[PDB]
Amino acid sequence: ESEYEERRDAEARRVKSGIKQASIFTLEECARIEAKIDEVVAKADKGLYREHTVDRAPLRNKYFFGEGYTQERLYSKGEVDDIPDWVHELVIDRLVTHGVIPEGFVNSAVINDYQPGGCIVSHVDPIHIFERPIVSVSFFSDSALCFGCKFLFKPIRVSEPVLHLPVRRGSVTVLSGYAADDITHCIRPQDIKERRAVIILRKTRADAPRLDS
Numbered sequence: 001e002s003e004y005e006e007r008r009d010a011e012a013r014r015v016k017s018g019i020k021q022a023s024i025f026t027l028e029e030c031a032r033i034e035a036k037i038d039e040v041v042a043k044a045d046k047g048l049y050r051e052h053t054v055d056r057a058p059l060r061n062k063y064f065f066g067e068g069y070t071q072e073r074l075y076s077k078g079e080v081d082d083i084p085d086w087v088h089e090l091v092i093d094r095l096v097t098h099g100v101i102p103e104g105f106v107n108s109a110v111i112n113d114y115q116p117g118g119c120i121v122s123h124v125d126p127i128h129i130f131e132r133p134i135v136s137v138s139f140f141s142d143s144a145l146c147f148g149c150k151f152l153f154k155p156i157r158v159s160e161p162v163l164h165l166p167v168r169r170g171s172v173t174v175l176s177g178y179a180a181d182d183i184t185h186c187i188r189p190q191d192i193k194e195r196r197a198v199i200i201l202r203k204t205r206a207d208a209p210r211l212d213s
């Protein structure tokens with residue numbers, strides 16, 4: 001019934017207005033990047049990174065490069081590891097060549113690695129920390145990015161998405177405007193049925209607040 005359908009669809013159009021998607025990477029180019037992601041996981045497992053580079057959760061690990069953060073604040077310089085050369089060579093440079101982002105934009109790369117059933121709770125990328133657009137490239141498997149969900153308790157549930165955005169393996173997702181600023185996004189446990197990883201590429205604001213030593 002409407003007005004529900006009408007009002008949901010109206011906001012979904014607003015969200016979509018701030019979403020651009022690209023492919024660019026072939027599946028063979030994806031497998032190559034996936035091999036590098038596996039190398040990062042292995043290196044972290046051997047404890048070869050700086051402490052704040054690696055954050056571990058039940059079904060999800062995050063790997064912070066370039067900049068890390070926590071009212072959110074960046075860590076002091078040198079607390080997380082530098083962006084690996086392969087992220088520049090295989091991912092950032094490709095997106096620059098294709099005009100998705102300008103040269104020198106990206107100074108933060110985060111890899112999220114999800115096991116089946118993994119998720120990330122609804123949030124807005126800290127607007128006082130990160131410039132827009134926010135760019136992500138997805139790997140290993142197909143999934144979906146949802147907008148506007150609430151993660152509820154008593155009992156545990158995730159509410160209905162305002163927008164459900166399919167994200168194929170190799171998909172490039174570019175968030176701006178409404179989709180980046182005016183609504184949350186998340187990954188629902190139900191949309192991670194197999195291992196999936198994502199590289200999130202961002203520019204920190206020159207005036208982003210930073211912890212001191």
Ligand SMILES: O=C(O)CCC(=O)C(=O)O
Pocket residue numbers: 112120125136145185186187198200
């Ligand atoms: O997994 C994704 O595509 C997005 C993850 C995300 O939004 C985040 O890590 O801040």
Ligand SMILES: [Mn+2]
Pocket residue numbers: 123124125185
């Ligand atoms: Mn996010």
